């Protein structure tokens, strides 16, 4: 029942009780109003009470009509008196291990199951119930002001139908999708995902190199772990550095610092093992592997 | 039904079944038949890696951990997922390879600093594998051994210049 | 618990308390009745109270037996104190977009599934749980008083069965049905339906006419949307108009008003592009397209 | 919370309040007990109240510890305060029409669905939730002291598994089963059903006689209806009748009464169209068809 | 609403009421506090009440602001006031008849389904919802303290996975497992199970031995039922017995006691029908069949 209607009903009871007590028992309007509240709240001090048979009958009627009405009114009154985030669409094992790396940031999880609510709240992420393919249930998860959206749904048709729903809300957020089949890598880039991570093509191409020597699958599963002794970090070249225009052979990063320069990224292209005559600029993101004792040595060497 | 598929005469068994409990049970069935064959498993959950490796699998590739680590690292910049998914594809410009150190090579006892493999050849030495361990970014005082495996990234004509530089 | 049983239980408590207080404490029947209400409502003025050990014990028994009973009774009492309609048989994707245009009126959605109770109540419709093929469940949904009944069920066998069930309840109501196959258009219409709307024959012909140029499909889906500029409206010719007896060539409605006379309908037929010799009569309905400023210029044109 | 634990908790509050008021305020044990009930029920007559600071503090503690406890206790108490039969195992359309002719008797219905509870209580039969194939859930429906048990389950395997569960409880009740296939008529008689009613063999043998003339299927569906003019009733021959030893030709029932003697049943065998030299006895049940004006004429002719 | 916030809200009401009554009506701080509790709890003794118009208005405000707040507070308070064990992994038909002989002890049934919560709680066991293959859900069920763990899961692949998960939590606990296929008896036993019980190999051999005469299957299913006359019991040989060093031929246990010595077991092996030269030692366990009057005649026989 709308709160305002309950308000009118309790006011009507108050008028009924106050006028009745005033006319039947002859007490002042103020005393009668006070008696009405004391009675319908069931306080019943007994400083005022009916002394006539008509007043007794009237009081029983007020008790029956008023106590329930007042109770509902007080409970309704109770109610009125009393960088950015990342959004994860869907819940699977690939997003469970993504949630371990994101304990410092605040994470919303948009999934349509109800049984998964105990797994999300244990990991430290707010759960938003809803269907991620719907634009109305994507706006509940604050897709519009997010840092990145991570889409991992059950199939590749729903992952595409969710990427196109996010691009309808805003065309500036970063979508990171996951492909289940190899053939749908190019459909998930046309829909609008910025980075497509196909895990069964990485896994299937590590189970074919591990037949003779398993060193390719031992390197990949180790440099991604933050508990390892070496880490793969991206070091950006700041504006006004000492290396703008300097080639890779003239820089000699591995001799002076101790990191291994396995690639240089400019914009959204990556050149693994860049050639000797590659000229640096300001804005190129250096992808390297080194100890943490060597990483701040690299930032102090390229600093302004 | 394993001995139908010639597990005794095989050189590698690749176990990838519908759940993680069936992958341990199939690994336990292979080790009863041939105790020295090379099993390459696939873990679904992260906590089952030490059980698949205790039950007998030599190499355990867990795809939902490599994908979970590459998702959370691609929020700011995705150059670490563009590195992993490009050195593995055999249609790419540069290949990640393994070369073995032959017996009687030119680099017996030679350290990695005075070898200067990136300057001489052009290949990127990201690790030297000895036996059943891999040392990513080995230090400057690391001395070689005849029988090592050098893991590297380089252009396909820079790899033939690496094998002729480590030749006997 | 049925409300009437709760009524009897509270009356029994009232008799018990009143008789007990009267006999044990010696107060009048009226005072005893009043005391019983004051006590079981938990008001407790204290103008009357037991003064004997037996009365004290009795009062504790009345408190235990009566307070809960009275509480349940007042809450049950609360519930009873606190053009025509349209009936929609079946819930689907055709009757969902029909319900958005029928806002403001009373709509009763008769559906077999209980899962659909949340979507019906969200869109502003009263849900009536039942099977729409049962004659005893159509009468529950108040079909006989309605102004139109909209039938859209799972198959065309259940749509004829729901149409035949309405034709014996009320043989005058307006039934709108939805055909799924083209063979059943003349079968649903003979069994009683006043308007048969087949969505797969409209969309089957709009897909074979959009191959060359899709202007046939843009005209149909824009004159029905009630958020565009032009609106396909229909105005009736009243008795004693200025056009009761003129031909279409001499009336010349498009120049003097600005609407487009796509068709006129007399009775239960429609004449699209009426010829110049067509004499306008009284009671005719002019189907037209125009801006809503041009519709008011046509409505005053056809007046007395 | 188990009801008995709530009982202990409220008793503990009562002891606490009574002892406290007695010792702190010096009232008798009886007055103190009464005051405790009046207070924790929130009645608060004020005939007794604390007059010392310690008593005031104590009373606030009793209010906080006792009012909620008493409220939960009264609501739990609410719950506890607030020939023979026939039992029907399973709910289908054949038992729905059986329930229409059993409105004078009391009927239990043992079905495992919960959605069917609204259909059973409308028809005037008590619903017992449970699986009818279990002996523990058959004893809840009072199979042991029933007049007849009527088994109509989804298949013929469960109908057999339910007949053998009833015969484990008692081997004297009358089981009336229904066969779904013709081949399982002899299995349902070996399990223990006294009468097997196979409806699809009656229906399949009436749809093959109704091709030429539909008079066989018009006779069967009419004499079973109690709204018909003629009815098929079984008239037993009492002990000490005027017809013992009399043949059918010497009796001439159709000449003197007007009923049609279509069979005579002795025990559990029926002889349709009995021969001329069939000698009557006492105990033979006469199966006849006649008007109700002719039936009491037949009982007055065979009477003692 | 968090319980602590409700606490603050009710404290604020208490301060408001107490200060108001003290200043407006002039009663002491203690009386004012008491009056506030009596009023917001709706007790209303009436020993204290406002006697001024301002006090009456104030009291109505306290009634409206305080009664609901106090009610919510007491209900929240309600919530805060109100050998070793055996773990059973999985719920099936083997662990249901195991649970009936484990009455009296603590049993924790770790099961994935939530449907089985009613059957576990009915039979006298604590239900622990979890997946029994997860090491984090075995430790939740308190496996490390237990005296035995009984594993009976859906397949033999999940039974080895649950056995391997216990062997790293506790490498000393007693695991009893159930094999489904005959090939996995030596596979479950090597992975850690202390006793492998295969029900389809016992029942496979009792069905091929009941063709000629079924006395082999009547011996097995009668010496295990704990309601028959004879009971297969096992008694241990204590230190300093009268038989520590005698052969079986000279001990002659069957004549002097009345039990049948079907086998004796030393350590982790069993010798069925031990020969006459078998020298009894200390610590041996004598597996025997006999009436419970004969078992006490054997237990005193093997004493000091």
XYZ file of C-alpha atoms in Angstrom, chain C residues 33-173:
141
model
C -16.247 -6.851 27.766
C -14.403 -3.521 27.677
C -11.680 -4.886 30.011
C -11.285 -7.928 27.778
C -10.675 -5.766 24.677
C -8.321 -3.443 26.553
C -6.368 -6.442 27.795
C -6.108 -8.604 24.669
C -5.206 -5.513 22.568
C -2.449 -4.905 25.159
C -3.734 -1.366 25.876
C -4.045 -2.071 29.642
C -5.401 1.230 31.014
C -5.625 -0.252 34.517
C -8.956 1.376 35.290
C -10.043 -2.266 35.761
C -7.753 -5.116 36.756
C -8.046 -8.327 38.816
C -7.871 -7.991 42.592
C -8.015 -11.674 43.516
C -5.419 -14.435 43.070
C -7.862 -16.399 40.867
C -8.402 -13.251 38.775
C -4.661 -12.783 38.410
C -4.198 -16.367 37.214
C -7.179 -16.039 34.875
C -5.766 -12.795 33.475
C -2.434 -14.477 32.687
C -4.335 -17.214 30.803
C -6.321 -14.602 28.826
C -3.068 -12.767 28.012
C -1.493 -15.962 26.641
C -4.592 -17.185 24.755
C -5.862 -13.799 23.623
C -3.066 -11.436 22.593
C -1.888 -13.546 19.648
C -5.430 -14.291 18.536
C -6.374 -10.622 18.615
C -3.186 -9.643 16.756
C -3.928 -12.093 13.924
C -7.548 -10.891 13.816
C -6.708 -7.199 13.465
C -4.191 -7.879 10.704
C -6.792 -9.934 8.780
C -9.346 -7.137 9.253
C -6.812 -4.668 7.801
C -6.916 -6.583 4.492
C -10.707 -6.302 4.069
C -10.847 -2.610 4.974
C -7.673 -1.810 2.989
C -13.921 2.368 -20.224
C -14.316 -1.363 -19.622
C -11.499 -3.877 -19.211
C -9.474 -5.856 -21.763
C -8.605 -9.541 -21.336
C -5.369 -10.941 -22.774
C -5.256 -14.731 -23.124
C -1.690 -15.966 -23.081
C 1.607 -14.163 -22.568
C 4.065 -13.852 -25.446
C 6.048 -11.306 -27.446
C 2.987 -10.044 -29.327
C 0.911 -9.368 -26.208
C 3.857 -7.683 -24.491
C 4.110 -4.880 -27.050
C 0.321 -4.705 -27.079
C 0.317 -4.056 -23.325
C 2.558 -0.986 -23.612
C 0.029 0.763 -25.854
C -2.844 -0.172 -23.501
C -1.574 1.807 -20.517
C -4.214 3.479 -18.386
C -6.928 0.883 -18.877
C -7.719 -2.279 -16.940
C -6.033 -5.348 -18.443
C -6.332 -8.926 -17.149
C -3.654 -11.314 -18.387
C -4.902 -14.905 -18.205
C -1.882 -17.204 -18.393
C -1.039 -20.774 -17.436
C 2.529 -20.190 -16.227
C 3.128 -18.826 -12.737
C 6.645 -17.705 -13.751
C 5.159 -14.852 -15.799
C 3.526 -13.250 -12.737
C 6.415 -10.826 -12.244
C 6.520 -9.533 -15.835
C 2.748 -8.998 -15.983
C 2.672 -7.115 -12.663
C 5.677 -5.021 -13.727
C 3.997 -3.803 -16.935
C 0.799 -2.673 -15.210
C -1.661 -5.556 -15.552
C -3.633 -7.778 -13.204
C -2.579 -11.416 -13.438
C -5.250 -14.135 -13.372
C -3.707 -17.587 -13.049
C -5.613 -20.143 -15.093
C -5.784 -22.157 -18.278
C -7.331 -19.981 -21.021
C -8.859 -22.991 -22.811
C -11.019 -23.911 -19.784
C -14.424 -22.222 -19.813
C -14.386 -22.162 -16.001
C -11.107 -20.193 -16.069
C -12.213 -17.689 -18.703
C -15.234 -16.696 -16.597
C -12.873 -16.205 -13.640
C -10.998 -13.571 -15.700
C -14.232 -11.635 -16.338
C -14.535 -12.099 -20.086
C -18.274 -11.294 -20.274
C -17.929 -7.659 -19.219
C -14.892 -6.870 -21.367
C -14.692 -4.660 -24.436
C -12.125 -6.812 -26.248
C -10.396 -10.160 -25.732
C -6.935 -10.692 -27.236
C -6.004 -14.328 -27.847
C -2.376 -15.258 -28.514
C -1.599 -18.787 -27.351
C 1.129 -21.328 -28.064
C -0.360 -22.991 -31.157
C -3.253 -22.420 -33.522
C -5.061 -25.388 -32.007
C -5.219 -23.722 -28.587
C -6.176 -20.411 -30.207
C -9.313 -21.918 -31.769
C -10.093 -23.692 -28.505
C -9.879 -20.420 -26.584
C -11.969 -18.642 -29.236
C -14.683 -21.313 -29.099
C -14.781 -21.027 -25.312
C -15.518 -17.304 -25.439
C -18.290 -17.657 -28.048
C -20.499 -19.497 -25.542
C -19.700 -17.224 -22.590
C -20.414 -14.022 -24.529
C -21.577 -14.052 -28.142
C -21.126 -10.289 -28.580
C -17.597 -9.491 -27.376
